[PDB]
């Protein structure tokens, strides 16, 4: 995708997230886990339920038409129904075709947009006291037991109260 | 001592193929038809008024082929003409048939 | 029954966009297409390995 | 702003299926989870499961698993709840409620009208 | 079940009531609480969410709290229009399913 993030630094996707699109995993002095980031994943559903109701919306309403199937030879007036129905439904056809190729294009590059939003977000909460390791994980220098993760993930982190520890521990 | 803070997304053991742009097939995690390519075989008598002719077209129940006088005065939203149909009256053509039968069809 | 989209083959739902069941349609429907299926992505890449 | 409307009284005889349905009019719910919750005549309120259809989610109460099938219909913005195998003890009225976001955690703030279903 | 409260409560008009719903570490304690105000015949409203957040359409005389794993409800300055059923409700990692407290009866004397 445009952004690199899903199929890229992220190296693969987690079959274990199960309540929700994007998340989090941690390790830390109390152990591991992991939590969806719920507002991440709203906003990429919302984003593509939003596409998905514009594309089914209205279909046409037609009553009487023309005939498009026919018993008897009839020569040019036959010839040009048949002409303009299949001209029709080629040009019909063809914008089906782009409609799907250009919604799914942009589906895969919004939801790698919504991984990579993500990744910044939470790297710049973390400001001086972690480093990307280029995974889409940070290394955080400073203990950070369950609440300290769960203020990162709630977006309450105070990178301050940290980064005298973390600063000692990075570069000294 | 720290800790390790991992970003990441969700998958699924198998997905569905979609096309894109640049690929005729690539695995996304859930799509939906956009073409409907079945029926039951059957049509619903609601909401558009039916009428379905049976043994007789609209141009024998127009004219009156007595067989088809059970038409009489009817109405319809859509008239069904069935294979099945045929005239049994005085033997006539009309010219046209195409464009009349569409008039009084409309 | 109840349908808004009558055809030749019998009535079909128009929830979606497009269809490929008869070019002959009455009433609100989705418009015809030559394809059999088309499908709309509604999640990301699956990326379940490496 | 966004209602949901509810399909009508139900009188369902033992061992019988209900299938109840729950439109969102006014906008869609497609982006949202749906729950289904009921209610027996004097009783709390009893969570069955719950759908969120561009999520691609669909979760049950473990104590009506394999009982109750949820679904969605994302063309017409309607959610449905049907229950088979229906006893006396399922007479109830059935609520259908959306959440906040697109999954089951956060709280329900839109309500249809409830179904009353009596067996 | 799973969330317990008490089955009645009661409370003369301005005067401030409380309503506790005690649950286990597998809701209460790792999850966030609702609570939802129903009258008789109606759907419920949702009055609080995330413990203690409250919908821009809910009088601020409405607060929530959570401690451990209890929560608790309370109504400031009761007003006659209050008199209601009150559910607290929760995420349960357990039974992998949304589950509520039985419910209490609030009667305005």
């Known amino acids: 995708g445009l952004f690199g993030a899903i199929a890229g630094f992220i190296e693969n996707g987690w079959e274990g997230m199960i309540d929700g699109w994007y998340g989090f995993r941690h390790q830390n002095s109390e152990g591991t886990g992991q939590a969806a980031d719920l507002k991440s994943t709203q906003a990429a559903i919302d984003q593509i339920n939003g596409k998905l109701n514009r594309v089914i919306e209205k279909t046409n309403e037609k009553f009487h038409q023309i005939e498009k199937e026919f018993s008897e030879v009839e020569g040019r007036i036959q010839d040009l129904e048949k002409y303009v129905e299949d001209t029709k439904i080629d040009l019909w056809s063809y914008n089906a075709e782009l409609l799907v190729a250009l919604e799914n294009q942009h589906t895969i590059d919004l939801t790698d947009s919504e991984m990579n939003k993500l990744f910044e977000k939470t790297g710049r909460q973390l400001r001086e006291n972690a480093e990307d390791m280029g995974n889409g994980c940070f290394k955080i220098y400073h203990k950070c037991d369950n609440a300290c993760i769960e203020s990162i993930r709630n977006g309450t982190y105070d990178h301050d109260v940290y980064r005298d520890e973390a600063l000692n521990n990075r570069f000294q | 001592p720290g800790a390790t803070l991992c970003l990441g997304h969700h998958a699924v053991p198998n997905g569905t193929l979609v096309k894109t742009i640049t690929d005729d097939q690539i695995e996304v995690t859930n799509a939906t038809e956009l073409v409907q390519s079945s029926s039951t075989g059957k049509i619903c008598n609601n909401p558009h008024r039916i009428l379905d002719g049976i043994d007789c077209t609209l141009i024998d129940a127009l004219l009156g082929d007595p067989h088809c006088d059970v038409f009489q005065n009817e109405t319809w939203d859509l008239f069904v003409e069935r294979s099945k149909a045929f005239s049994n009256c005085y033997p006539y053509d009309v010219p046209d048939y195409a464009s009349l039968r569409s008039l009084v069809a409309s | 029954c109840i349908s808004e989209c009558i055809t030749p083959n019998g009535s079909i739902p128009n929830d979606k966009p497009f269809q490929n069941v008869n070019k002959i349609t009455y009433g609100a429907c989705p418009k015809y297409v030559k394809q059999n299926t088309l499908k709309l992505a509604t999640g990301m890449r699956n990326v379940p390995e490496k | 702003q966004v209602q949901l409307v509810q399909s009508g009284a139900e009188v369902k005889k033992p061992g019988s299926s209900v299938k109840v349905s729950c439109k969102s009019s006014?906008?869609?719910?497609?982006?949202?989870?749906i729950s289904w919750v009921r209610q027996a005549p004097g009783q709390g309120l009893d969570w069955m499961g719950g759908?969120?259809?561009?999520?691609?989610?669909?979760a049950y109460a473990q104590k009506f698993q394999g009982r109750v099938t949820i679904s969605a219909d994302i063309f017409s913005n309607t959610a449905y709840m049907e229950l088979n195998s229906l006893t006396s003890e399922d007479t109830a009225v059935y609520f259908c409620?959306?959440?906040?976001?697109?999954?089951?955690?956060?709280?329900?703030?839109?309500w249809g009208q409830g179904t009353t279903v009596t067996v | 079940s799973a969330l317990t409260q008490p089955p009645a409560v009661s409370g003369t008009p301005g005067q401030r009531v409380t309503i506790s719903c005690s649950g286990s570490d597998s809701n209460i304690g790792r999850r966030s609480v609702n609570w939802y105000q129903q009258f008789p015949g109606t759907a419920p409203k949702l009055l609080i969410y995330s413990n203690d957040q409250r919908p821009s359409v809910v009088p601020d005389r409405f607060s929530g709290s959570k401690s451990g794993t209890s929560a608790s409800l309370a109504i400031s300055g009761l007003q006659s229009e209050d008199e209601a059923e009150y559910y607290c409700?929760?995420?349960?990692?357990?039974?992998?399913?949304?589950?509520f407290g039985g419910g209490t009866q609030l009667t305005v004397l």
């Open positions: 409700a929760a995420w349960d990692d357990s039974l992998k399913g949304a589950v």
């Open positions: 409620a959306r959440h906040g976001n697109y999954y089951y955690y956060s709280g329900m703030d839109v």
């Open positions: 759908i969120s259809p561009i999520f691609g989610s669909t």
């Open positions: 006014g906008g869609t719910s497609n982006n949202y989870a």
